[PDB]
Amino acid sequence: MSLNVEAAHPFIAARIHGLDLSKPLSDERIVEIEQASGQYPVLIFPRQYIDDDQLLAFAAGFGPLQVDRRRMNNLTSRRWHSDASYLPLPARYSFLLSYIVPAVGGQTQFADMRAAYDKLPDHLRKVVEGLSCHYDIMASRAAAGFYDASDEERKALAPCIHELVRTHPISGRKSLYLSSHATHVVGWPEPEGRDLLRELTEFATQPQFVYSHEWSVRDLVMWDNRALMHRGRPHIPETDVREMHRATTLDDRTWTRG
């Protein structure tokens, strides 16, 4: 590892200095970043004054790009979730580049699902092994108070199923596939499934599993949805402007770099 890696948290997040992401990275550098993400699933590249084309070009090195509603997305993102876990093909890495940072609040917080899995009480460890869960965007929106959706969107975003205990392809780490999108456990009565997910979510978002990112202008933050949940925090006052540019890659295990 020749990358200049500086831990921002002992195991969730790290800064990577000395990169100019306005230029395409070499293949060896992209691999190094992937390896660094296996240790720290949140990577912060400070002071990246890049435009959207360059942001998208950087993101596209790690997977295929994902191809009112501002109010809805703002409020639902305040709940712990993993990006696009409600899709059969969820997100791989997500990317957020800050343009304008509010003075108070507005953190993005990250919860380590590997650490949460590792620290589970023995009886919960035994219970989660081999389970699968239902993931349902319309149910999670309804829980946040949003009930309006076209029949086309409901069909296009029909609920799916994912295994609860994941194994990361880079690091081999086991982790919990928690998300606000997960409703209950496949093959279990709904109440017992909801209660298990309630208990796991409270456990996995205790402070020892959480890194709270205090944003700086032009931070590029890249996070691995395969190992995390994340959420946005309100900024105070809400009238302050907060401008973030986003890109998302999909976890297509058949995709290959060039």
In b/e form, how buried is each residue of 66-96, taking b as 16+ CB within 10 angstroms?
A: beeeeeeeeebbebbbbbbbbbeebbbbbbb
Partner in contact with 143, chosen from Fe ion, a copy of itself, none, beta carbon below 5 to 8 Å by kind: a copy of itself
Q: Which of 75, 67, 63 is nearest to 34 (CA)?
A: 63
Amino acid at 197: L
Tally of helices (H runs) and strands (E runs) in the chain: 8, 14
Q: Is 53 helix (H, G, I), strand (E, B) or coil?
A: helix
Site residues for Fe ion, 153-182, by CB under 5 A, read none
189 binds a copy of itself (CB under 8 A): yes
Which residues lie below 8 Å from residue 201, measured CB to CB, with a gap of 6+? Answer: 80, 178
Residues 130-149 that bind a copy of itself (CB under 8 A): 143-146
Size of the site for Fe ion (CB under 5 A): 1
Between 105 and 131, name the residue whose CB sits nearer to Fe ion. 105
| Structural element, H or E, at residue 59 | helix 52-59
Binding to a copy of itself (CB under 8 A) within 219-238 occurs at 234, 236-237
Q: Which residue is nearest to Fe ion (CB)?
A: 83
Stretch of 43-51, 80-88, 217-225, 234-242 lying at the interface with Fe ion (CB under 5 A): 80-88
Told to check if 71 binds a copy of itself by CB under 8 A, we report yes
Q: Considering beta carbons, is residue 83 or 112 the nearer one to Fe ion?
A: 83
Please tell me whether 112 is known to bind a ligand.
no
Q: Is 106 exposed, middle or buried (0-12, 13-18, 19+ CB in 10 A)?
A: buried
Closest to a copy of itself by CB, 21 vs 196, is 196
Rounded Cα distance, 62 and 170, in Å: 12
Tokens in use for 81?
Answer: 């979730």
Alpha-carbon gap, residue 165 to 167, rounded angstroms: 7
**8 Å CB contact between 96 and 110:** no
Shortest Cβ distance from residue 140 to a copy of itself (Å)? 12
Instruction: Name which of Fe ion, a copy of itself, none residue 83 binds, using a CB cut-off of 5 to 8 Å depending on partner kind.
Output: Fe ion
Candidates 6, 27, 51, 195: give the one binding a copy of itself (CB under 8 A): 195
Q: Which of 83, 112, 219, 224 binds Fe ion (CB under 5 A)?
A: 83
Question: Residue positions in the annotated binding site?
Answer: 81, 83, 230
Where along the sequence are the contacts to Fe ion (CB under 5 A)? Answer: 83
Question: Residue positions in the annotated binding site for Fe(2+)?
Answer: 81, 83, 230
Where along the sequence are the contacts to a copy of itself (CB under 8 A)? Answer: 71-72, 75, 78-79, 121, 123, 143-146, 184, 189-195, 198-199, 234, 236-237
